[PDB]
């Protein structure tokens, strides 16, 4: 045993990291607001659209900060129509520098300082949950979670989602509806606690899971058919074909389509060195701005048909 | 904020369970040798077929002991041709023996862990190697000493956490399929990874793994016919291991005839097969020796499947001469 384990390195616990990099009272309030507002949208209490938007991944804290300032300025302008959460997708925990210098403790610390800095300016954040131990380190600052399409069918991720304190999306169709259904139940599994030791976790079940379609009226009505009683609304995942997607979705929204409650957009300062993604290609700020303005107007037109 | 965590209960650490339910010397030797024989077959040092066979899941220790006794006698007679490992699957994607060993809704995971480790010790103690589906990533810390073979289910092939787990496991791991996702998993598990994981004392740490050169692809579908198998060989990169065919219920014996006809005619790329088998055939809702999850063939059909496979392997040694 352990012939293929080189070794083990000490890891600060979540509790430890929360004392070292504590959240401000503004961060904490911003994360709680972003959850309430997402929950109101995806459960239909609220008629805005939730928009998850930002960089494919984060590699640079200042770049991230600047983006976060533009988006917060825009989010102020469009808040009658759109609830906005920044994708802060973390890559950074596993290797924060590079030259393959796998300094996970420095990675958790930066990841957490990043989340605290984002939410301190009143901008709620959303993340891909990949790992099942890392959310213990960051979850107090998150308002939204996505399970990637590689892991929608993974029992561990569905258990994880069940115990999360925020809405979680699952990417496609039957696997994603079976994921939401399984996340909604109580589960019992071996998990790591705040104090960094294994224990048996019992979860309550997450009634705020929803499907992410990764777009045309015919698809969406086929998607609505499959949806059990008790469903939340659909989210649409949108490099440069994202504005075309927007147009078709915007036209459903304006014409009365109430089952589309959210969208996701990969977007950075610049399109495709400062402010450009080192993973997937994203649209740049100015195309983001116009996608969003157009979404907002369509949400307005929608209050009108209703 | 913990609003959807009802709470936490205490969990015996792996180190503690290993002291309370120690492996015997025989147990430990049987696991070692199972790895060695698997390795030799999947890497083409040995011209036997690796056969992983047994129940879809185990819910009953005594029944599994009886099956194991029958398999192990059978394995003693066919061992010039087949190398046998018993499927001892304890986690199903009822979630199985660990999560709920009383199979009601009580979730006594500490009792599960103890029954699972007692199960594995009891099987390997008679000289019969075992193999299990690795779903949870903490549970292999409890049990890995006893294991000779590991499989990653088709739902978690593309999961990064499972490819990283596989990279650190001390035994060969199969990945389920189309093929690209299984090959990419094999390739990823071959590398060194760095992740947060749980140690033997039950604390989270940063694990660094070395990479696992003994990963291979399991074809599970029809995937098993000479044309599909040639299509799989042409996807396979330079350092590839051999292919394993999953027979999965009443059709298992027809799959076996087609695979056996390939083998006996000289197909050297089929090194293993996987067979869902129990004392008695079929399944039941939540009766002795009958599966409570997927339907299995019963012992009598299994003996005959494995006798026919053994003969195809003898016949293949003939062709390669």
UniProtKB/Swiss-Prot annotation, chain A:
Keywords: Acetylation, Amino-acid biosynthesis, Aromatic amino acid biosynthesis, Stress response, Transferase. It catalyses: D-erythrose 4-phosphate + phosphoenolpyruvate + H2O = 7-phospho-2-dehydro-3-deoxy-D-arabino-heptonate + phosphate. InterPro entries: Aldolase_TIM, DAHP1/KDSA, DAHP_synth_1. Inhibited by tyrosine. This is Phospho-2-dehydro-3-deoxyheptonate aldolase, tyrosine-inhibited. The lineage of its organism: Eukaryota, Fungi, Dikarya, Ascomycota, Saccharomycotina. Pathway: Metabolic intermediate biosynthesis; chorismate biosynthesis; chorismate from D-erythrose 4-phosphate and phosphoenolpyruvate: step 1/7. Induction: By amino acid starvation. One of its GO terms (molecular function) is 3-deoxy-7-phosphoheptulonate synthase activity. GO terms for biological process: amino acid biosynthetic process; aromatic amino acid family biosynthetic process; chorismate biosynthetic process. NCBIfam families: aroFGH, PRK12755.1. Belongs to the class-I DAHP synthase family. The keyword Acetylation applies. Stereospecific condensation of phosphoenolpyruvate (PEP) and D-erythrose-4-phosphate (E4P) giving rise to 3-deoxy-D-arabino-heptulosonate-7-phosphate (DAHP). Its EC number is 2.5.1.54. Disulfide bonds: none annotated. Present with 26300 molecules/cell in log phase SD medium. It comes from the Eukaryota. GO terms for cellular component: cytoplasm; nucleus. It is an enzyme of class 2 (transferase).
């Amino acid at each position: 045993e352990d012939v293929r384990i080189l070794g083990y390195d000490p890891l600060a616990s979540p509790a430890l990291l929360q004392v070292q990099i504590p959240a401000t009272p503004t961060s904490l309030e911003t994360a709680k607001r972003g959850r309430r507002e997402a929950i109101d949208i995806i459960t239909g209490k609220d008629d805005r659209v939730l928009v998850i938007v930002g960089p494919c991944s984060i590699h640079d804290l200042e770049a991230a900060q600047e983006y976060a300032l533009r988006l917060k300025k825009l989010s102020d302008e469009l808040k009658g129509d759109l609830s906005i959460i920044m994708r802060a997708y973390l890559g950074l925990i596993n290797d924060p520098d590079v030259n393959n210098t796998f300094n996970i403790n420095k990675g958790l610390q930066s990841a957490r300082q990043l989340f605290v800095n984002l939410t301190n300016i009143g901008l709620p954040i959303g993340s891909e949950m990949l790992d099942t131990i890392s959310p213990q380190y960051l979850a107090d600052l998150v308002s939204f979670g996505a399970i990637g399409a590689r892991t929608t069918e993974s029992q561990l991720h569905r258990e994880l989602a069940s115990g999360l304190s925020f809405p979680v999306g699952f990417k496609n169709l039957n696997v994603a509806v079976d994921a939401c259904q399984a996340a909604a139940h109580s589960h019992h599994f071996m998990g790591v606690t705040k104090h960094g030791v294994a224990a048996i976790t019992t979860t309550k079940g997450n009634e705020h899971c929803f499907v992410i379609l990764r777009y045309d009226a015919k698809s969406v009505a086929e998607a609505k058919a499959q949806l059990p009683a008790g469903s939340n609304g659909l989210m649409i995942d949108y490099f440069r074909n994202q504005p075309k997607v927007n147009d078709v979705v915007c036209e459903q929204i304006a014409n009365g389509e109430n089952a589309i409650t959210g969208v996701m957009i990969e977007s950075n300062i610049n399109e495709g060195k400062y402010g450009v993604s080192i993973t997937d290609a994203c649209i740049g700020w100015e195309t983001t701005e116009d996608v969003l303005r157009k979404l907002a107007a369509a949400v307005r037109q929608r209050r009108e048909v209703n």
